[PDB]
Amino acid sequence: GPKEWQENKSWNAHFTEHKSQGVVVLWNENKQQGFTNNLKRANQAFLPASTFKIPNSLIALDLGVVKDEHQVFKWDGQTRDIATWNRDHNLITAMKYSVVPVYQEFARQIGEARMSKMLHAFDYGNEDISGNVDSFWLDGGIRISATEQISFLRKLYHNKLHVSERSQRIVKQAMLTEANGDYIIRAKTGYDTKIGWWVGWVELDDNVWFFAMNMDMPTSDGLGLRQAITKEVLKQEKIIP
Amino acid sequence: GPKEWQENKSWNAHFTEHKSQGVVVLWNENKQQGFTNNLKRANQAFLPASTFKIPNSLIALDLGVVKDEHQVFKWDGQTRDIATWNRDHNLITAMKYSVVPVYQEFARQIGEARMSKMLHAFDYGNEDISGNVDSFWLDGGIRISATEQISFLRKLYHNKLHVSERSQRIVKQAMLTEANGDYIIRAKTGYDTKIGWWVGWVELDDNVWFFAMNMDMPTSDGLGLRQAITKEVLKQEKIIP
Ligand SMILES: *C(=O)N1C[C@H](NOS(=O)(=O)O)CC[C@H]1C(N)=O
Ligand SMILES: *C(=O)N1C[C@H](NOS(=O)(=O)O)CC[C@H]1C(N)=O
Ligand SMILES: [Cl-]
Numbered sequence A, B: 001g002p003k004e005w006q007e008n009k010s011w012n013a014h015f016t017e018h019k020s021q022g023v024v025v026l027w028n029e030n031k032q033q034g035f036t037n038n039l040k041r042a043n044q045a046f047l048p049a050s051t052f053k054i055p056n057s058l059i060a061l062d063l064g065v066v067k068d069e070h071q072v073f074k075w076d077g078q079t080r081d082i083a084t085w086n087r088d089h090n091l092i093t094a095m096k097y098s099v100v101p102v103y104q105e106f107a108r109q110i111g112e113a114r115m116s117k118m119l120h121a122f123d124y125g126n127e128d129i130s131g132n133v134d135s136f137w138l139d140g141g142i143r144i145s146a147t148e149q150i151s152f153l154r155k156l157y158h159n160k161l162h163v164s165e166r167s168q169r170i171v172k173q174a175m176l177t178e179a180n181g182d183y184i185i186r187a188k189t190g191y192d193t194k195i196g197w198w199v200g201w202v203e204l205d206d207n208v209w210f211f212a213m214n215m216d217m218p219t220s221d222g223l224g225l226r227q228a229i230t231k232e233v234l235k236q237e238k239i240i241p
Helices: A009-016 A049-063 A091-096 A100-110 A112-122 A146-157 A165-174 A225-236 B009-016 B049-063 B091-096 B100-110 B112-122 B146-157 B165-174 B225-236
Strands: A005-007 A022-028 A033-036 A176-179 A184-191 A195-203 A208-216 B005-007 B022-028 B033-036 B176-179 B184-191 B195-203 B208-216
Touching: A009 A225, A022 A146, A022 A225, A033 A146, A049 A091, A049 A100, A049 A112, A049 A146, A049 A165, A049 A184, A049 A195, A091 A165, A100 A112, A146 A165, A146 A195, A146 A208, A165 A176, A165 B165, A195 A225, A208 A225, B009 B022, B009 B225, B022 B146, B022 B225, B033 B146, B049 B091, B049 B100, B049 B112, B049 B146, B049 B165, B049 B184, B049 B195, B091 B165, B100 B112, B146 B165, B146 B195, B146 B208, B165 B176, B195 B225, B208 B225
Parallel strands: A005 A033, B005 B033
Antiparallel strands: A022 A033, A022 A208, A176 A184, A176 B176, A184 A195, A195 A208, B022 B033, B022 B208, B176 B184, B184 B195, B195 B208
16 A cells, blocks of 8 residues: 655755755645655654744634734834844734744733643644743743644644634734745744754645754754755655746 | 825836836825826726626625635536636635636626625625626626725725625635735736736735736737736835835
């Protein structure tokens, strides 16, 4: 019989070209088949860092902490290192610019009991929120693997998560990253100071490819490699031109 | 004091450069002010042609004629001149490739009584569905102006049309045309053998610009000028780079 999961080590060339190491995991939805350059690392669990703003957004919307994607979260007046954070935001721009202080406020309003119950209902990673209610995805006990990211994203794509369909549609809107006549990418980046993430999917006319990548990332200087390397794999597999 | 609509005839150079004539209408949502090169033509009502796929989609979804944006509508097997039409489609690709036969079947299932009632509820153009229920937007009595297109699109953007929020969110997803780190365009083209249309909006971080353009289109050779001329105006107004 055919294999659900296949290893393709030729993708390592795209990491080695940049003196880095990592994993790309792809899932072909039509074929129900997955592909990766590193089967073991594909299933190892890491801190989600800013990719947690996908479930955080879903929970905040479903609970009414965030009313809709137009509600304004005012800047608290503290000047931070990332210039795009020093302004008012809504859900769309807070995800686009990965605005930490806005999502810390969401997490505090959600609170520990409801955050834990929702991640259990999502089957999200190891479901463990130990640590600070407003930072556990960066320095606490939650862990998720690349294959677990894909499983979560597939439920989101199909509106199968336990939260309202409305919440799922709003977050999928907020994940929009790039679109043209050839493809649509909905995705979210993350960085925990050691590992960089990019997770999401590529919508084509007749198929959707889910992806989850992480890579060793010692400094923020190489952050654009997250998208660049993933796109090299997508080009090799003839998913995008 | 300032006027709701300002005329900017310098945009005519973008039509003149292509030996063409037409109108571009812009609406700045934050400032609640509009701009056009031709106020008279901005209020001239034309057949909507394929821009009618926006209200048609909304009605089909709200009535359950279309269950969701993934439902597949099989090719009926008749070979038509536009090759992308000769295949199975869902709502996303039917709007992307402007697949008339799919939308003709939606319209027949909606039926004239519900179609007329919903266009009245939408305040859509002259609300006149005289002709065949499956072709009145191509060769019947319905007429809509560029400013009326803006009015309709503003209601859709704000979820204020008399259909479910869900239907409006799905259609706005289906209108997605282009997205990058600078802007998002949601829009729909149309062509009636005499006039070409492009209507929609540009989402920025902190504003939305609605647009509706139409131009004289004697042959199909110049159809790419609908987007190209509109983008020259957007570039001149520093809405997009
Ligand atoms: C999330 O991982 N973080 C917030 C912000 N996002 O940048 S990313 O999306 O481009 O990686 C900066 C990195 C990180 C953090 N420092 O908390
Ligand atoms: C809609 O106006 N039509 C369907 C199709 N779409 O072309 S467009 O979207 O690029 O203008 C072809 C033109 C037109 C029609 N023939 O009815
Ligand atoms: Cl979208």
